[PDB]
Design a protein around this ligand. Structure first.
Ligand SMILES: O=c1[nH]c2cc(C(F)(F)F)c(N3CCOCC3)cc2n(CP(=O)(O)O)c1=O
Ligand SMILES: O=c1[nH]c2cc(C(F)(F)F)c(N3CCOCC3)cc2n(CP(=O)(O)O)c1=O
Ligand SMILES: CNC(=O)N1N=C(c2ccc(N)cc2)c2cc3c(cc2C[C@H]1C)OCO3
Lengths: 81, 370, 49, 122
């Protein structure tokens, strides 16, 4: 309030807490320390620099499946005397 | 009273010509002219003694600078970028902050061109290149078994010869096989399609990065900046920037402070120009911590090779310093808020930082990717 | 009161919220996330941000 | 790697057929020839892939240029300068304009080095 005794002491105490680091410490305490997502959220080292493994793993799987089918064909081929 | 520092208060090109208030131009000059318009008073612009900031001595304990001129009645007001601190609030009154700032990191702008043997494999992956050979040997081991031709009938067996035939698939399109073979036809049938998709994706992705070259490689985080020692980072020899890392309670700034204290070579510099020059000469291997107000202005000046990375670390601001018990204290305290709510302060910020900055946006589009 | 911020009405022109409680002496201080504005600096004093 | 038991024409004519086609198979079928042709096919594959990719890069960065029929975009670029007359209604029109586009154009022409204004129209 205008003309109150607490004006100047609080005006100085705010600066005292900011220069000491207690204000930023409380900010980090009640924003990041108690935050459910403590570390970075959904952040990779870099957003898709090249190609992902799951992207080619399917072609690798169709290759393995083709090789297996060819092994089956070879198995029915050598049995034919 | 105000200090002559770039770009807040600068002398015009014809400073010798004419006299009075036209001899100075910059942010604080327009702010002083606007304060005189919203308060109504005749103002004379004076330069602080020998360029001293608001600092109290330790031995003689004498106030020097702009704060000193207000204490001893030598000046009536100080419209200048003076940081609001507890030590200065005791002697002279402060208006509400007209501009917020904080210590930030300045690094050299990274180059995009990266030729070398280490980049040819980058278009795929560290793992896909090591998996294509595993697929090749997985096909060779099937070619070891699918190489069965018709003999009247416990076999001739395949040793040495099978690996010879198998190696051929990596060079040629694939298959190789044996003539009149039923199972090798499909071995090479799936192999050719697999390697076709692989080479198609390689060429397609290679085209994608010869058109879109972004290559943003800075971590952009202070905590990871402390977790690496390749790119050094330092502050000033003396000042509030160094003292903030000294008396910091957060473990990140304490790790950074121990790194700078046990730095060989010494990461601290005497002047700001030495830090800017070290950042510009280290080719991206040096970082300089300084207030964001100067970091942005250096980023907006030639040769535009400096960049302000990340955000601020502390919360401080510049305010107009008024003498204790002066008539101008409250009217200026209100005029600052009036100028901030109207938007004139941000308009002047954009005017003197980006509009007059040497580093323009640069031509839209264009072709520089030959 | 009823979760009001420091705001002055337009019709009745009555200060309601924390600024209102400080103006009429109902409260002594307001340690709360209250934005420093010109409209509120005129009636009640503000500390540094 | 061929028959070299001591001018030889046999190993001088075989060399070009592997450079063109994909593989290294001629009359002899030797594993050492496979590993000669094994790295060659991959090398030329990378070469042609990079050639085609860069060719796409220059067929993509050639048709992404903007001709610009709008003045607002003409103000957003600085390689192609634009100016008016030293004196006349066009310059005063850019002077007292309330639209931010003509104000940007006017600031560009006012802070122009060299001066974009000319004396005559010709
Ligand atoms: O109150 C203070 N205000 C300050 C304001 C500025 C500027 F940004 F120019 F406005 C600077 N600089 C930063 C860039 O290098 C040149 C001078 C230093 C200041 N210091 C000294 P610190 O102890 O090193 O912080 C103060 O004490
Ligand atoms: O009323 C006016 N009518 C005008 C008519 C013409 C023309 F187009 F030739 F008819 C021209 N030119 C355009 C090309 O440059 C040579 C002369 C200028 C005119 N001006 C001068 P402004 O002040 O520069 O506009 C007037 O004032
Ligand atoms: C002149 N080269 C060049 O400017 N670059 N190198 C290519 C590159 C081009 C061809 C080949 N064969 C290999 C690399 C490249 C590969 C990448 C990539 C970005 C590039 C573009 C730059 C680094 O991001 C991921 O992968």
């Amino acid at each position: 309030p205008k003309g109150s005794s607490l004006g100047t002491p609080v005006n100085l105490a705010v600066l005292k807490l900011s220069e000491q680091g207690l204000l930023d410490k409380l900010k980090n305490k009640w924003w990041y320390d108690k935050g459910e997502c403590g570390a970075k959220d959904s952040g990779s080292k870099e957003k898709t620099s090249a190609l992902s493994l799951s992207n080619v793993a399917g072609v690798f799987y169709i290759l393995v499946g083709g090789l297996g089918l060819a092994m089956l064909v070879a198995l029915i081929e050598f049995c034919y005397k | 009273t105000t200090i002559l520092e770039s770009p807040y208060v600068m002398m015009k090109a014809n400073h010798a010509a004419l006299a009075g208030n036209e001899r100075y131009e910059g942010y604080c000059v327009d702010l002083a002219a606007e304060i005189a318009k919203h308060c109504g008073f005749k103002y004379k612009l004076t330069i602080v003694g020998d360029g001293k900031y608001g600092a109290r001595d330790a031995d003689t304990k004498i106030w020097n600078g702009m704060v000193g001129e207000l204490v001893y009645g030598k000046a009536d007001i100080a419209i200048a970028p003076l940081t609001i601190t507890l030590v200065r609030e005791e002697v002279i009154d402060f208006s509400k902050p007209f501009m917020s700032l904080g210590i930030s990191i300045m690094i050299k702008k990274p180059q995009k061109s990266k030729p070398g043997v280490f980049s040819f494999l980058d278009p795929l992956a560290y793992e896909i290149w090591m998996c294509i050979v595993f697929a090749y040997i997985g096909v060779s081991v099937v070619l070891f078994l699918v190489s069965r031709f018709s003999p009247y009938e416990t076999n001739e067996f395949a040793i040495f010869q099978s690996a010879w035939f198998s190696l051929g698939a990596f060079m040629q399109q694939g298959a190789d096989i044996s003539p009149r073979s039923l199972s090798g036809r499909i071995v090479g049938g799936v192999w050719w399609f697999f390697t076709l998709i692989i080479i198609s994706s390689y060429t397609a992705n290679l085209a994608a990065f010869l058109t879109v070259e972004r290559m943003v490689s800075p971590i952009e985080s202070a905590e990871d900046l402390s977790k690496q020692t390749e790119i050094a980072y330092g502050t000033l020899d003396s000042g509030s920037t160094k003292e903030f890392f000294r008396r910091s309670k957060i473990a990140v700034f304490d790790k950074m402070w121990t790194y700078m204290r046990s730095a060989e070579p010494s990461v601290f510099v005497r002047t700001t120009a030495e830090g800017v020059a070290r950042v510009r000469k280290s080719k991206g291997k040096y970082a300089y911590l300084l207030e964001s107000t100067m970091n942005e202005y250096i980023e907006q000046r030639k040769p535009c090779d400096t960049m302000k990375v990340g955000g601020n670390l502390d919360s401080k601001g510049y305010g107009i310093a008024t003498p204790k018990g002066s008539s101008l204290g409250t009217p200026v305290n209100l005029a600052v808020l009036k100028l901030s709510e109207q938007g004139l302060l941000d308009k002047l910020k954009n005017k003197w930082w980006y509009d007059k900055g040497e580093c323009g946006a640069k031509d839209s589009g264009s072709k520089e990717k030959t």
